[PDB]
Design a protein around this motif. Structure first.
Motif, mmCIF file in Angstrom:
data_model
loop_
_atom_site.group_PDB
_atom_site.id
_atom_site.type_symbol
_atom_site.label_atom_id
_atom_site.label_comp_id
_atom_site.label_asym_id
_atom_site.label_seq_id
_atom_site.Cartn_x
_atom_site.Cartn_y
_atom_site.Cartn_z
ATOM 1 N N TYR A 1 -17.023 68.209 77.659
ATOM 2 C CA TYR A 1 -18.930 66.966 77.007
ATOM 3 C C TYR A 1 -19.426 67.334 78.428
ATOM 4 O O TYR A 1 -21.033 67.663 78.254
ATOM 5 C CB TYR A 1 -18.531 65.639 77.365
ATOM 6 N N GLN A 2 -19.123 67.370 79.761
ATOM 7 C CA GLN A 2 -20.036 68.086 80.901
ATOM 8 C C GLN A 2 -20.876 68.739 80.982
ATOM 9 O O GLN A 2 -22.002 68.997 80.849
ATOM 10 C CB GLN A 2 -18.913 67.642 82.159
ATOM 11 N N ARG B 1 -33.567 73.297 76.877
ATOM 12 C CA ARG B 1 -34.343 72.227 76.244
ATOM 13 C C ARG B 1 -35.315 72.432 77.040
ATOM 14 O O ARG B 1 -36.494 72.700 77.450
ATOM 15 C CB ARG B 1 -33.959 70.932 75.712
ATOM 16 N N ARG B 2 -35.092 72.761 78.847
ATOM 17 C CA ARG B 2 -35.708 72.420 79.255
ATOM 18 C C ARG B 2 -36.959 73.953 80.137
ATOM 19 O O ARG B 2 -37.367 74.437 80.259
ATOM 20 C CB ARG B 2 -34.479 72.232 80.922
ATOM 21 N N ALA C 1 -28.829 70.589 77.912
ATOM 22 C CA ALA C 1 -30.163 70.165 79.390
ATOM 23 C C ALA C 1 -30.862 71.364 79.610
ATOM 24 O O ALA C 1 -31.530 71.277 79.368
ATOM 25 C CB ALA C 1 -29.519 68.988 79.795
ATOM 26 N N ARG D 1 -23.586 68.586 77.989
ATOM 27 C CA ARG D 1 -24.865 68.680 78.298
ATOM 28 C C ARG D 1 -25.437 69.181 79.655
ATOM 29 O O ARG D 1 -26.185 69.011 79.138
ATOM 30 C CB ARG D 1 -23.844 66.566 78.768
ATOM 31 N N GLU D 2 -24.577 69.625 80.170
ATOM 32 C CA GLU D 2 -25.631 70.375 80.766
ATOM 33 C C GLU D 2 -25.977 72.120 80.366
ATOM 34 O O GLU D 2 -27.270 72.133 80.362
ATOM 35 C CB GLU D 2 -24.525 71.246 82.260
#
Lengths: 52, 393
Positions: free
Chosen positions: A17-18, A28-29, A25, A21-22
């Motif tokens: 999950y870590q 998207r950025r 993220a 999520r990274e």
């Protein structure tokens, strides 16, 4: 039993999950940064600094 | 709002008589010469004075006054006579006071004379001392009546004292020459046995009485708790009394005023009090949103004493982040509406943290930037515009 038998293997799955999520993220950025730089370069632009 | 405006410039005069108010740079004879801030404070003071009239004459009689006015107007509204009866749809002050006197039998002419015709608010400076010998509480309430916006109060005044035996109300008569008011105090037998201390409502709680004085039973004092006058109170309690009033009170205005008064006491017991308020659901959410900023100010004042991480960071990761990843925030689910407001107000207060060098720490700035990067709103039924706007703030 390289001679009479066999079995398949798969690729290493990243179910963490870590790092998921990274990855989501940072992707998207990066896509929103690329989109905003492309739209600011191909149009009228402003700048907080002189000739920036 | 009104005590700030009336102490700033003169005062708002409801019902002037035709200048009646010459302390201010415009004429109050017409609505179109009023300043807009005066018009706003006029409406604000009018509804607070109506709350005061409800305090003197009970709410059901007040609604009966309003129903009598509406019923006269609606019998008037159906006639055809050209104003023989159409002027019963117009209210005046004398007609309103006469309808109040008709429904209740009490007239409010002292309250009308004080808060309508006179244009001022009152300022209370209170300090107490507990007489251990005679078991009394000697209050000392003095008014500042020489400021430009102020006036002198001579009526009765309610005070609520929370002692170990419970919460007791007392009415004080504050005449012009009055300064010391001796009220009686109860036992301290709930410190002999561990019993629960009963609160303002019917409930009772366990209090940690280690910070309390051994000789005094009283836990906190509140001068004018029900806001029954247009007042500004400056009470001098001890810091443990403010912390007990922040923790165990069942009134939100007393929790807010204890938050406001704990900024002068930066002791670690006050940090523990505000942190226990912040962790506590079943506290009103606008008290926790104030405790964020109070905790930020206290944390800025006790630098070179602060032990662990910056304030509210561990609390943010405990409340709003994942259990397995502390620096990754949970995906946005804004369906609770109280942890949404607290979540969007906690980094705004957390950013007011400063180091010994007067620069914001790079542990809080990095935390805010990671709150911005890991924000995922594809899953809640609500928009993210206010939370992201507060992140920019």
């Amino acid at each position: 039993p390289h001679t009479y038998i066999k079995t398949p293997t798969y690729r290493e799955p990243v179910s963490d999950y870590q790092v998921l999520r990274e990855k989501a993220a940072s992707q998207r950025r990066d896509v929103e940064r690329a989109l905003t730089r492309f739209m600011a370069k191909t149009g009228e632009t402003q700048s907080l600094f002189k000739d920036d | 709002k009104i005590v700030a405006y009336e102490l700033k410039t003169g005062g708002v005069l409801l019902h002037p008589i035709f200048n009646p108010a010459s302390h201010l740079h415009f004429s109050i004879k017409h609505p179109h010469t009023l300043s807009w801030e005066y018009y706003s404070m006029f409406q604000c003071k009018a509804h607070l004075v109506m709350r005061l009239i409800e305090n003197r004459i009970s709410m059901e009689f007040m609604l009966q006054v309003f129903n009598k006015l509406l019923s006269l107007a609606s019998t008037a509204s159906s006639q055809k006579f050209q104003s023989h009866m159409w002027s019963q749809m117009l209210v005046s002050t004398s007609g309103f006071l006469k309808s109040i006197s008709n429904v209740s039998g009490k007239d409010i002419q002292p309250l009308i004379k004080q808060w309508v015709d006179q244009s001022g608010v009152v300022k209370f400076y209170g300090s107490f001392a507990f007489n251990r010998k005679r078991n009394v509480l000697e209050l000392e309430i003095k008014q500042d009546y020489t400021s430009p916006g102020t006036q002198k109060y001579v009526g009765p005044l309610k005070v609520t004292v929370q002692e170990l035996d419970g919460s007791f109300n007392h009415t004080l008569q504050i005449e012009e020459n009055s300064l010391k008011h001796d009220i009686p105090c109860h036992s301290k037998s709930r410190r002999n046995k561990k019993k629960k201390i009963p609160l303002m409502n019917g409930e009772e709680v366990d209090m940690d009485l280690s910070a309390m004085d051994a000789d005094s039973p009283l836990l906190w004092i509140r001068i004018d708790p029900d806001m029954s006058v247009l007042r500004k109170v400056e009470f001098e309690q001890a810091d443990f009394m403010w912390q007990y009033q922040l923790r165990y009170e069942r009134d939100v205005v007393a929790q807010q005023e204890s938050i406001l008064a704990l900024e002068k006491f930066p002791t670690p017991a006050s940090r523990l009090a505000l942190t226990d308020i912040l962790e506590q659901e079943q506290c009103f959410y606008r008290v926790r949103m104030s405790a964020c900023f109070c905790l930020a100010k206290i944390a800025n004042s006790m630098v070179s004493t602060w032990t662990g991480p910056p304030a509210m960071k561990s609390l943010f990761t405990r409340m709003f982040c994942c259990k397995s990843c502390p620096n990754i925030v949970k995906t946005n689910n804004f369906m609770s509406f109280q942890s949404y407001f607290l979540q969007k107000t906690m980094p705004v207060a957390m950013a007011l943290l400063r180091d010994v060098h007067n620069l914001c720490p790079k542990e809080v700035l990095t935390f805010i930037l990671d709150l911005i990067k890991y924000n995922d709103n594809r899953k809640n039924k609500f928009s993210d515009n206010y939370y992201r706007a507060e992140m920019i703030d």
